[PDB]
């Protein structure tokens, strides 16, 4: 299908960014859309092969789009502003009117200062003793707190193997400091297994949180650890008790 890179991009105000789209091979039509939080996608620009024939959706002449060879497309946003923050969606179709296939989107967050960027702290909460005895089941809860921006991907790992069964992760994060514009976030997840799967000392449950932030390319002058793109995880081992 259609792919887009990167998944997440955190940018300092005033810097230039590049958003890449690799469409499905042999697709004449390429669409860019903008999706600001709480809204549906909004048309930005259209490509018929290499030709950019409609760019009536572009917010300003800061938005530069290209598709030089009729395939890979780049949306360059020069001198990024706070208003540019959103999900950018690439779609390609077999022709202007045929069904559009969308990529997974690029999530861009433009911040005033990169000192606002914080990796999450992660914690795992072991299932309730009353739950096990009452339901025969054991719900573990993961807690990712204090991250900025909202760029995470949380996953549960049981005995070194990722699990999707029995997992529930909040669709949207909570704001810890709702007053401020660059508010840090909180996010919770649940993993539910049957009691005896938890009641095993050799069993191993890990909450992994992929945080997308800075890189060595960015510069850092603060005392605390550079908030680079990293994995932060907490783990609980089963208990016989």
Q: Which residues are near other proteins by CB under 8 A?
A: 2, 28-29, 31, 33, 40-43, 46, 48-49, 51, 53-54, 89, 91, 93-105, 123-131, 134-135, 137, 139-141, 143, 165-172, 174, 178, 186, 188, 190, 192-194, 234-236
Residue closest to 191 by CA, chosen among 134, 136, 126, 129:
126
Residues 6+ apart with CB under 8 A from 51: none
Nearest distance in Å: CB 219, other proteins: 31
Query: Token pair 């780049």 is at which residue?
Result: 74
Nearest distance in Å: CB 181, other proteins: 16
Nearest distance in Å: CB 177, other proteins: 8
The answer to whether 208 touches 97, Cβ cutoff 8 Å, is no
Nearest distance in Å: CB 191, other proteins: 9
Residue closest to 117 by CA, chosen among 180, 184, 215:
184
Beta bridge partners of 62: none
Beta bridge partners of 32: 45, 90
Backbone φ/ψ region at 49: left (φ over 0), alpha (ψ -120 to 50), beta: left
Taking the least distance from each CB to other proteins, the nearer of 29 and 114 is: 29
Taking the least distance from each CB to other proteins, the nearer of 112 and 235 is: 235
Query: Token pair 């603060």 is at which residue?
Result: 222
CA quadruple 180, 182, 184, 190: dihedral positive or negative?
positive
Structure tokens given for 12: 């300092």
**CA distance linking residue 69 with residue 149, whole number of Å:** 34
Taking the least distance from each CB to other proteins, the nearer of 106 and 114 is: 106
Nearest distance in Å: CB 78, other proteins: 24
Nearest distance in Å: CB 48, other proteins: 5
Taking the least distance from each CB to other proteins, the nearer of 114 and 198 is: 198
Taking the least distance from each CB to other proteins, the nearer of 38 and 160 is: 38
In this structure, what is the dihedral angle of CA atoms 92, 77, 34, 55, given to the nearest 10 degrees?
-70
Taking the least distance from each CB to other proteins, the nearer of 80 and 93 is: 93
């Amino acid at each position: 299908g259609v792919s887009q890179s990167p998944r997440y991009k955190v940018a300092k105000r005033g810097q230039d960014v590049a958003l890449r789209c690799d469409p499905i091979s042999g697709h004449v039509s390429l669409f860019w859309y903008q999706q600001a939080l709480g809204q549906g996608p909004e048309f930005l620009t259209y490509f018929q092969n290499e030709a950019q024939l409609d760019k009536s959706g572009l917010p300003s002449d800061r938005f530069f789009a290209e598709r030089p060879e009729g395939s890979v497309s780049t949306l360059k946003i020069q001198r990024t502003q706070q208003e540019d923050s959103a999900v950018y969606l690439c779609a390609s179709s077999l022709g202007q009117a045929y069904e559009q296939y969308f990529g997974p989107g690029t999530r861009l967050t433009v911040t005033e200062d990169l000192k606002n960027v914080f990796p999450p702290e992660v914690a795992v909460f072991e299932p309730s003793e009353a739950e096990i005895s009452h339901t025969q089941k054991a719900t573990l809860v993961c807690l990712a707190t204090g991250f900025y921006p909202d760029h995470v991907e949380l996953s549960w790992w049981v005995n070194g193997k990722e699990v999707h069964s029995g997992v529930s992760t909040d669709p949207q994060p909570l704001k810890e400091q709702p007053a401020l514009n660059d508010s840090r976030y909180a996010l919770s997840s649940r993993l539910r297994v049957s009691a005896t799967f938890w009641q095993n000392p050799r069993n191993h449950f890990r909450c992994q949180v992929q945080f997308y932030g800075l890189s060595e390319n960015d510069e850092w002058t603060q005392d605390r650890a550079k908030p680079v793109t990293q994995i932060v995880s907490a783990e609980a081992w089963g208990r016989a008790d």
